[PDB]
From a paper:
Here, we show that dipeptidyl peptidase 11 (DPP11), a central metabolic enzyme in these bacteria, undergoes a conformational change upon peptide binding to distinguish substrates from end products. The upper helical domain dictates the specificity of the enzyme and caps the catalytic domain, which has a typical chymotrypsin double β-barrel fold.
We determined the structures for the inactive constructs PgDPP1122-720 S655A, PeDPP1122-717 S652A and its complexes with the dipeptides Arg-Asp and Arg-Glu, as well as the substrate Leu-Asp-Val-Trp, at 2.4, 2.85, 2.2, 2.1 and 2.6 Å resolution, referred to as PgDPP11, PeDPP11, PeDPP11:RD, PeDPP11:RE and PeDPP11:LDVWs, respectively. The bound-peptide is anchored at its N-terminus primarily by N332 (N-anchor) located in the helical domain. Evolutionary conserved R670 is responsible for the Asp/Glu specificity at subsite S1: its guanidinium group directly interacts with the substrate carboxyl group of Asp/Glu. Analysis of PeDPP11:RD using Naccess32 revealed a large loss of solvent-accessible area upon peptide binding, approximately 1430 Å2. However, our crystal structures of DPP11 in complex with LDVW and dipeptide RD are both in closed conformation, excluding the possibility that solvent released from the protein’s cleft would explain the larger increase in entropy upon substrate binding.
Author numbering:
A (entry chain A): 21 to 723
B (entry chain B): 21 to 410, 414 to 718
The structure:
Amino acid sequence: MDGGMWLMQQINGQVARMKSLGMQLEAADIYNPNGSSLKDAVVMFDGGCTGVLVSNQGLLLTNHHCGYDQIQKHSSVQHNYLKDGFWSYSLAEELVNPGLEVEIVDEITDVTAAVKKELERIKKPSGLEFLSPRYLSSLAPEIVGKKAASRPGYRYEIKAFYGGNRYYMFTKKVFRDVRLVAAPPSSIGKFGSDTDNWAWPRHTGDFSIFRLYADKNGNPAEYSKDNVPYRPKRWVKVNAQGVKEGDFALIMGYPGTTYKFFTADEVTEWSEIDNNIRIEMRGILQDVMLREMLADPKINIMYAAKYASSQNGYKRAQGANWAIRRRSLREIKLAQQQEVLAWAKQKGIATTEEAVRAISKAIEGRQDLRMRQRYLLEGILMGIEMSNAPAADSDIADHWDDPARREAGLQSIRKQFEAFFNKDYSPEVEKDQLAIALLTRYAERIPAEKQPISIREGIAEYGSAKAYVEMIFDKSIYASRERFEEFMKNPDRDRLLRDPMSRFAASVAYEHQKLAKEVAAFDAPLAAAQRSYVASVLDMKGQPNLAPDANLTLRFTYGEIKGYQPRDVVTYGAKSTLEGVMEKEDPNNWEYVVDPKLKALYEAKNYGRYANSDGSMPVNFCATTHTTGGNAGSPVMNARGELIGLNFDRNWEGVGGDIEYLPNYQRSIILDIRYLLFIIDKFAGCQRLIDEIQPQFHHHHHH
Amino acid sequence: MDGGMWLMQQINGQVARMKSLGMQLEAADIYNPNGSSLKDAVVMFDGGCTGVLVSNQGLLLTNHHCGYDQIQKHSSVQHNYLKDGFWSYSLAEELVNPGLEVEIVDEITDVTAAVKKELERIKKPSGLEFLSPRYLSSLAPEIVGKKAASRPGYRYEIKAFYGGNRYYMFTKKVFRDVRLVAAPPSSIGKFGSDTDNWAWPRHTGDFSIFRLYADKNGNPAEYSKDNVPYRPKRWVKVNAQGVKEGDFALIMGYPGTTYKFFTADEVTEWSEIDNNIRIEMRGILQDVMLREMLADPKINIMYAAKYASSQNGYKRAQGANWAIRRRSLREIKLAQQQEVLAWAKQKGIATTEEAVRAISKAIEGRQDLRMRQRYLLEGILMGIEMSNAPSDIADHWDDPARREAGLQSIRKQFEAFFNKDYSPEVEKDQLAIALLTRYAERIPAEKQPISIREGIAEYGSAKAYVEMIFDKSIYASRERFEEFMKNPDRDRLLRDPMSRFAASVAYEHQKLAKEVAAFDAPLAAAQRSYVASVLDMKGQPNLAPDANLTLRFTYGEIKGYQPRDVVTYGAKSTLEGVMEKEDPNNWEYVVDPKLKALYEAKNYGRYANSDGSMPVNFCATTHTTGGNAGSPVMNARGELIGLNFDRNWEGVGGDIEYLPNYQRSIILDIRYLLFIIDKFAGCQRLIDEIQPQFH
Ligand SMILES: N[C@@H](CC(=O)O)C(=O)O
Ligand SMILES: N[C@@H](CC(=O)O)C(=O)O
Ligand code: NA
């Protein structure tokens, strides 16, 4: 009911208030630098989600939409796991996921002084790199030596906190053999996918299941046929006795990005540029994409993750903008900045007003460039796959006459053609309506002299975006795999250098890097000013009582299970049920199709031990915890640190929580652990997974 | 929350239970055959709405959407009362309304015997007369006698009840000078108009205000400049102390149509024919019309009442079909008919099974006869306005007398067609063609009207046949009409292709009616028989008949509901709910800046709730339907606390089966009405005439 995404180091400062709210854990149970704690079971999944370890054999719970990527990679029309789900009945049946990584925090260390000496010590500093997660983590070898650039299963991550006023280093253990164990069908894992997304009430069985594997010694490893299940330090026990309104809830995970120190001008700019442009372009992309998917099951698999990811950010941006409107978020941030300015004024501090003024100036100044960046990013880089077309390298200059180097150049083109023309790319989807609809709006919004060279010249020569795209596919050697291979049997140097799809990709990448290099003149003073401003906020409040913005590192949040009042006349309860699914069923609406087995279960009320005390079958619940993107898959724990749920979304009003926590409107939306178990047991019949999890049901205990 | 639209005569049978629910009125207070009662203040408005009298000088409250037709008629781009509302500050400023009538029920009498004994010796009956309001009412002279019957200020109404098993007569005092006193702007009067229509929560200030006028001697009269305000026997006192969940609510009004005695098959037919067809046709009409209205201010005014009326039936049909499906209403009615069937079996009554059999058979036989009656109605007769295009040719074309009377009539026939609200520019472009396109798509060319068959055949399309209608007909524009009007030719007048249209449309209409009588006559006869059985089984004093646009009462409590998993709706809405919905770029959620300023300043006076919020709407467990708009909602002591104006979404299925947990009447809090008059319009005179109690 109070917000903030707290550092693991900040547990000592929160533990009293957490206990007063009914928590029955000690601080060292949650985070222990000198031993085992809940931290060890709370896992970063695939770079941008959370997972929780729930058995001594490394079983890993996370969301369906977090596992969505790997589910999609294993799917085909024949074996459509997206549609049908997937269940493994032994370890040998668990699917290998090449490239998939899971990370566990081994150590947390303040490296503020070390990083600052190192940021200093730079002649002619780039605009600003004291915030770059790339550059900062490149400092790790100098901070810890060989133990970094040597130890195979380790990764050192250094990030900026408080706008660059602190640096914390996370020592990570990296698992590179993570196998898919189970997933529900998408009619369960993403029931009401578009319409119910960012919405409470919710009725979505959003989970998937993986397992960490390790080598003969229990260490993280690359995939091997001889790897065995990882046996974790600590795992979380599942409590399946139920939850009620008022219950203390604890969440740990990896929240990605928040903006709690935004000034009023930053709120408006983010709304007017980043969010508006994302909503505009992605709406176009999605109208076309969805139509193509519903009409063809192979296309639907190919573009499933691409579409789900686009839609998710599209609707999030809609939610953020309506939150700013309905909750008056800009006015709140203005009032807060005025408080810190009044604080500084009273203390005789002049820097703070300087910072706020320099922020406004940088925002106002970068307006043209940023809007160009967002249109380029949203309309072309993300939606038009032609951006990834091959391009010639040391063909044509260093060595077209050299047999060895020419073969290497032809090889390079062959290699990036395979990356471009991958199994998820459909030229039909791309050349028919998608690329043309996006480029037509793009060209309308960006004036001709500010468009990438190939696009402006292409539209001038041919009639339009539509004519220019059609020409690109008529003439490019990469329009199809068959044309490509036919050309490669007799490669021509010209034609290779003049390829209009290759020209398109090169002009877009050139403008992307040009926009970046130019906008640095604004983004730099902006970042310096932000550091100054947050430094004042750190003086006013103290560091121990100030939660920093999310930056994809381990955090905890807490609060209680609780519904809310979205609007006049309306009250939303805290807990969802299976009857809510049946109320929504519509065989003719793709997002509300219900699996006949689930319906059969409901009509027979065959819920076994997973039912509520009133006889209804629980599905989701919601809580006053403070989460954001990256917190998907986060374990939700009761007062005793037992697993009662999996976090997977926020309510509509809660999208505003990235800018300001409002206790009456902010809610995490959570998968009831009893629903998860019900789907495993009664729906799928995968009893061995029930056996391995060992859910606690409150029999008396026998010793 | 027991449901039923009770006869006024059935008040004696209901009063005990009503008192059990908190009512502290007597029966005679509500209806009194031999003296003044609440009946005298509850009024039928414009033939199809309700209103209520609230001052001793004949002030009349009704809904905004009931007065919409008159607000629309008086409006123009300058003096735009639809957009800006309208307020009169003296008697003289009140706006005259030619054609608008209001009826007050004077007396109610049982005429069952007399009526039945007169439907005998109708040599060779059509089989449809005994349900006909006009035929039945045309029987009234020989019931009451020529003298009381020919009275200028009275009208006699006779309608069938219980499917034709009872007949009651209503004597109406009829007022033909009803003047507009006040209306809020449409941003208040239908806030959230399409999206929030048929929906709770609701935040709509749905009212308008009229006044009844009379002559020197205080009696009903035609308009005349010398008319004075009518002084009612009784009028309803307004209570402004507020309401809360659980309060008793009484409603009186004129519910139009319900179908509580439908068999299963009738539920099925009504759904898949009437509603399905209304929905698809009105969907296409609405799309076109709204885009036109929104793109041009003047069009928006001309077509405002047409669009709103259409959209309201369109969404109602959506709601009705949604109820049929989600409450399995067919199976519920099936269960009910099987309880009366089993009842008949244990009595040895063969009547009922044959009736249910005959209903099924008639529904079966009239399928595409009636399936076509509706496409014609929805697609053409109501959508396409050239359906009313115009001695004378033959009989006296050469005679300067009946060739001098003929075409002037065709000018009174043309003025009615090309009227103040008709825009030929909208028709061609998309309207008439989009409708006819779909029409022809779904009616075999063989079955279409003889004019329509001809030209999709000749010309490439319906699009081009309409294109030919305007290019080659005299009535396509007023300029073209008055030009070849000094030049009356007797060859291209019968050959006018827009006239050829209206004639065949109207012909194919009547032939369907004639063809359907062979199925509708047995259907009606069989329904009568069924409902007679239901009447035998249940008591008549305890069975409420279907609505039939006569005066009824319903009662219940102020109460919200739980529409779906996780969700609870409260019983009362507030002004904050308006402000939460505001969107300057969405026409239906536009908020007047004076209303928002009142909200920002909390300038509510004695009209606010106790918690300081400003009430707007509330909802109740009463049983209402189309025709109850503008009905007075009264408290335990017969005092006015609201005006009914809608149902919630689940409530639409209430015309087939009443569901206590879901069915709600959506009601204008009378304090919101007062607040808009007082704080928003500053029309203090109306607040003085009304005189709210705050006790
Ligand atoms: N659904 C988000 C979580 C959130 O935005 O609250 C995610 O995938 O991490
Ligand atoms: N809105 C309707 C009332 C209802 O159908 O409940 C009317 O005009 O009478
Ligand atoms: Na500062």
